[PDB]
Amino acid sequence: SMNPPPPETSNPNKPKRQTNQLQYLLRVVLKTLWKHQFAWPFQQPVDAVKLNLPDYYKIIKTPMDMGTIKKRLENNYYWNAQECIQDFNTMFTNCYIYNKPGDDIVLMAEALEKLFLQKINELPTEE
Ligand SMILES: O=c1cc(N2CCNCC2)oc2c(-c3ccccc3)cccc12
Incomplete structure (x- = not known):
């Protein structure tokens, strides 16, 4: 059993910016979810080998994690x-x-998503 390579976090071929909205997404949104009691399973990619989920990456073709x-x-x-x-x-x-x-795991995701929705509701207008 093998995990795929994780999603890229750097790409010099991809245009990028700093925006006040993206700053809010780090300082408020990510920070809030990261410190939550149910954050830990979502703080790194799903290790389908260690968790014995050999069908995980057959069903999930766009993996993502915090x-x-x-x-x-x-x-x-x-x-x-x-x-x-x-x-x-x-x-x-x-x-x-x-x-x-x-x-x-679904209850954990739902708790994080509730907070996520609350925080993005007050995403600031783009400066
Ligand atoms: O969809 C998932 C599905 C699952 N599983 C299916 C149910 N049994 C636990 C693993 O785990 C997940 C985990 C996880 C990581 C480490 C420990 C526990 C959970 C993290 C993120 C997503 C999943």
Whole structure:
């Protein structure tokens, strides 16, 4: 059993910016979810080998995790806020796609997503 390579966190061929919205996504949104009691499973890529989930990367073709998002934000990898917001949503959706409703991992994702939605509701207007 093998894990795929993780998502890229640097790409000199990809245009990127610092924006006040992206700064908010790191300082407020990522920071808030990262410190949460249920953050730990989402702080790095899913290790499908160690977790004995050999079908994981057959079902999940767009893996994403907050470790990757954190690195991307710190590196200023993104062009806009929507790209980063999409990464968070991909992470949550992967969990709901792979697992059953009410599973502990799904409950954890739901708690993080609730806070995510609350914080992005107050995403500042672009300066
Ligand atoms: O979709 C998942 C599906 C699963 N599993 C399916 C249910 N049993 C635990 C692993 O785990 C996940 C984990 C995880 C990582 C380390 C320990 C525990 C969980 C993290 C993120 C997503 C999943």
